[PDB]
Amino acid sequence: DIVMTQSPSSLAMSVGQKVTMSCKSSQSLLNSSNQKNYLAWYQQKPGQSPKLLVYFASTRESGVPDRFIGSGSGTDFTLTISSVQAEDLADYFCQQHYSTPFTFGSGTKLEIKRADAAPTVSIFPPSSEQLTSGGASVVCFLNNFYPKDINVKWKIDGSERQNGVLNSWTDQDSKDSTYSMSSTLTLTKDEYERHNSYTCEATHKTSTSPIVKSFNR
């Protein structure tokens, strides 16, 4: 079968920068019948279905911004974004329409770079509803921060608690290019009621000292 080799695996670009992505086929995709290259580029934003950007190597699909440019012939093809916009973050991949099976490239993840943004931290004690049932989850939100690197420390009565902590990250925002993360310390009502002070500490490059949020049960 035809093998589509895509590169690089990922790119981090500042808004306005020109991005180049490669797509190389193990066989020429040039059809001798119409002298057209049977390769297309698609864009897949987080949680969405892939959308057609360019087909026949260089023909933009109706409605596609002209900053998306396709070129190349035979085996070597390229997708260019002349000036990356914050909304352009997504997975980009190629597919050959030359012969079955119509194989895909493994894709290129495009992420955005930007200025610093300190996280807004909020801590939430378990709800009366949950405690009613015997559960006790302590939730901490770290919202709209950049860069992505960060670290949350949970403390119970002034001592670090590591186990039982699960985090979740949002996809990079297509508007402000920031990230948000949730941190959840899952306890039981009985366990929760044997301690007094609960603390969520966020360490981020935007500050040498941690952002601290606490409450007393």
Added chain:
Amino acid sequence: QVQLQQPGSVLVRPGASVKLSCKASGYTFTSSWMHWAKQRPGQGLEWIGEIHPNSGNTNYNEKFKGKATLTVDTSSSTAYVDLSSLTSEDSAVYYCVRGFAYWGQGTLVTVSAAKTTAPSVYPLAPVSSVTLGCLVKGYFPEPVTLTWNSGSLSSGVHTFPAVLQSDLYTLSSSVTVTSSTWPSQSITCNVAHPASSTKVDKKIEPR
């Protein structure tokens, strides 16, 4: 205009089979090849095969012969793919595609023996801006939908992807509003878990 309706997700027990559907609209069903593709979070997309609704002719990827069977129903303008004897390797999102141009919504296939379970929805109230929360804990399988004020409160909202443990997902969503607007203006998270036919509206109330 073109649309390819695919069920959100399907739960299939290991060793069992499943029939995925793809209802087409906005174009003549019999005037285009219908493709099917498999996508796993791990690696690159895979072309499963194609079928032409006007003749029933099919072309398969050698790798999927004996795993996938493509059929069509021209009377309902629907394309189907039968996946046989699923393993964990068969867990993925399956797309139907009109030609190479238009991609369907994609069906999430979860291969598991785990039991479908409705989630518990808990309000997250605070201990110039205030942040509220919604905790959706212990549901299966994916997915769930979460809106604020029936969807009218869209700005300043962050819904975090769920986490998985012992066959149960847990998800949360935060909403940040001007502090002088709450709690005077009520804020409510609307949660729906189709699998367990669960519909919950949780109003966030001050502690």
